[PDB]
């Protein structure tokens, strides 16, 4: 009908006008007198061996000592970073795994992939072994990311254009967030666990609120898929990485774009992004086997974590900001510092 | 310079490492095949001869074949295809009886072109299966092949199945210096549909071994 043709267009024009009218200056202009961070040099302090295939995801424990890694060889390993010892090695039922998570309390872990099912494993058992605590089903596409709200809730996103908030004990879909138009490739949870953002192959990001379960803001500007997304520690900004070789910093409160991190020599697509504890650095893992460190407030490269022989698939920063773990397709995790 | 608990933890880690190595060695001696098709193009029949991913295991001449079917994935194909980068062969199912219904053969040709020239599958041989031989002959008895291939110019007999159908599908691999295509006609009941896969896999494995040796 004519409504879809005209009302949507005029509302979009109004949104554009409102966004433009609320742009007094740019972040670059404001942060012109800030002294540059200077060259950043990081050396591989630990290398973790034991995976026999590509690594597709990893997550740091809440205590910044234990981490979990998932690969296509069908194993989910838990490493003690300080000494590189192995604490657990869970054999998955389906070897097509494309995500993993670590519960904040450290009891459970989660994983999923091409089987469209999210498996939740329990670590603290009286029998001394690790057994599947629960299996959550109800997604009609591959599952690409999962994060723990707490010991009894979890949010997942799949290649179905929908996100779902579950209830582990009952095993049902407590809430379903819909509105995208393409595969949802990653999501991040706000520090206060009240809002969360998701980026999709629609070339856009959306900000949902967990309680009411409804879209609240849509951020556009990219020109291709989005493969990663992360919140700014403050909780009022998030950074997205796409396939057009460019990162972007979006602001929730201003409802606009702030800055874009790109370089002419870079043509490959990003696979993961993360922030530093103070939010003054933005680490991004590219597809050319490198991993750059951008000055978040100036968009000037400050270093390069070149130590991998294949794609950098996963990237993470500890809770206390003392280490950076990068896992690549050569079946290696490296902890810098 | 380590406490007793630390030494026990190191011992446990070494045991876990041994178990992981043994499992990897066991799993590296298996043949992996990826099955692709245009839909209801005889896939079920081929599976019979031997949610999401569907895995089928079978054994032949002391070899373990794992066949992965991805028919249930309606999402974008360019975001999870790179998972299957190490597969040793891509079985492709096509129906010669679809040249009349609707055009379907053009869709199969487009899918074959997309898969065969993918960045990741630049070194994996393709085993091509042509199905519904008897039905195709029965239909070509009356309908002509020009309905689907207007440029075709030849007699209307099953002997022209190997011509302008096999040739058309084998002409799409624009990188002929690194991968090979094996085509085999099949029917409802042949009993040799698994021998052909064995021969193709043996050739691929010989090539891989020679390449690893450096001779190539």
């Amino acid at each position, epitope marked *: 009908l004519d409504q879809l043709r005209q009302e949507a267009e005029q509302l979009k024009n109004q949104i554009r006008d409102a966004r433009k009218a609320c742009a007094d200056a740019t972040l670059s202009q404001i942060t012109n007198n800030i002294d540059p961070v200077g060259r950043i040099q990081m050396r591989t302090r630990r290398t973790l061996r034991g995976h026999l295939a590509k690594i597709y995801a990893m997550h740091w424990g809440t205590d910044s*000592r234990l981490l979990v890694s998932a690969s296509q060889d069908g194993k989910l390993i838990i490493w003690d970073s300080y000494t590189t010892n192995k604490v657990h090695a869970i054999p998955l039922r389906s070897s097509w795994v494309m995500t993993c998570a670590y519960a904040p309390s450290g009891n459970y872990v989660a994983c999923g992939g091409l089987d469209n099912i999210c498996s939740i494993y329990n670590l603290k058992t*009286r029998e*001394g072994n690790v057994r599947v605590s629960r299996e959550l089903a109800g997604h009609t596409g591959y599952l690409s990311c999962c994060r723990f709200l707490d010991d009894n809730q979890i949010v997942t996103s799949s290649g179905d254009t929908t996100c779902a908030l579950w209830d582990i004990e009952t095993g049902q879909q407590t809430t379903t967030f819909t509105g995208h138009t393409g595969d949802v490739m990653s999501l991040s949870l706000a520090p206060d666990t009240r809002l969360f953002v998701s980026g999709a192959c629609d070339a856009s990001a959306k900000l949902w609120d967990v309680r009411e379960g409804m879209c609240r803001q849509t951020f556009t500007g990219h020109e291709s898929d989005i493969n990663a997304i992360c919140f700014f520690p403050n909780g009022n900004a998030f950074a997205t990485g796409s396939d057009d070789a460019t990162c972007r910093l979006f602001d929730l409160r201003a409802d606009q774009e702030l800055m874009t991190y790109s370089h002419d020599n870079i043509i490959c697509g990003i696979t993961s992004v993360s922030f530093s504890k103070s939010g003054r650095l933005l680490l991004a893992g590219y597809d050319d086997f490198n991993c750059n460190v951008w000055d978040a407030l100036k968009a000037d490269r400050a270093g390069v974590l070149a130590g991998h022989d294949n794609r950098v698939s996963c990237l993470g920063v500890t809770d206390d900001g003392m280490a950076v773990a990068t896992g690549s397709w050569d079946s290696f995790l490296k902890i810098w510092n | 310079t380590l406490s*007793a608990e630390d030494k026990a933890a190191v011992e*446990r880690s070494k045991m876990i490492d041994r178990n992981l190595r043994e499992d990897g060695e066991k799993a590296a001696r298996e043949v992996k095949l990826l099955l692709l098709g245009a839909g209801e193009s005889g896939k079920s029949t081929i599976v019979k001869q031997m949610t999401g991913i569907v895995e089928t295991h079978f054994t032949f001449k002391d070899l373990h074949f794992k066949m992965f079917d991805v028919g249930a994935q309606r999402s974008e194909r360019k975001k999870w295809i790179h998972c299957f980068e190490g597969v040793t062969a891509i079985i492709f199912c096509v129906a010669l009886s679809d040249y009349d219904l609707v055009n379907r053969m053009h869709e199969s040709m487009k899918l074959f072109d997309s898969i065969c020239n993918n960045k990741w599958f630049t070194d994996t041989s393709i085993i091509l299966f042509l199905n519904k031989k008897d039905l195709f002959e029965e239909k070509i008895k009356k309908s002509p092949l020009t309905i689907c291939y207007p440029e075709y110019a030849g007699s209307n007999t099953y002997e022209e199945a190997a011509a302008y159908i096999q040739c058309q599908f084998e002409d799409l691999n624009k990188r002929k210096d690194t991968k090979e295509i094996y085509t085999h006609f099949t029917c409802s009941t042949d009993t040799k549909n698994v021998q052909f896969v064995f021969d193709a896999v043996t050739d691929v494995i010989i090539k891989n071994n020679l390449k690893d040796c450096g001779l190539f």
Partner: single-chain antibody
Amino acid sequence: DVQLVESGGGLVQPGGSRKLSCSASGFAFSSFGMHWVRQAPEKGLEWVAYISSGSGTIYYADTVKGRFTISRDDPKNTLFLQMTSLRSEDTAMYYCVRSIYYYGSSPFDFWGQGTTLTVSSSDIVMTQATSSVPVTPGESVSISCRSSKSLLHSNGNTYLYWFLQRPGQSPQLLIYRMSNLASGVPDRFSGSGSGTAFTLTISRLEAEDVGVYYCMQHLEYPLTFGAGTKLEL
């Protein structure tokens, strides 16, 4: 349910031989190291042997070196201890303890039930000055344990375990590493102290708390237990 049941005890003559068996049901016996711990008739506990997971490590006490043998059979989930050339000082009640070692784990969670054996005719010295302490319910109590050598390793951990043994029962773990609280223990119990001086505090004391409290070290493998403090009334 998790349980260990043990057998092979009875009268024996000096110079004889005997075998003790401990059967485990309810947990992954293949991933747990196993200790054999003695308990004299009316005295404190004493460590007798240790066998690791995979049988790659075996340790014996200096008093039974070369005289006892310890083995495990995973397929049938059994633990064997062969004793040869018994002496009149070997009369005791042997236990069967489990322990799994990994970061954040808890050793000595479960104790067996005990088989009574009767025979007819450099080490850290943990000290427990107090022996008897009369206490009334509703009050708070403190138990002090001292060691001959500092128990604070370079890792920052401090290996010091507190066990409780009620009358006519096997000991149960209360605290591991002087701070952590064993699973299932009420929150009243707490532990504190620096190297070479440790204390355990109970705030509200209930009827089901009378027993004997033992403090053990885990730094050097010739494990040593304290004399033991008992609470009365």
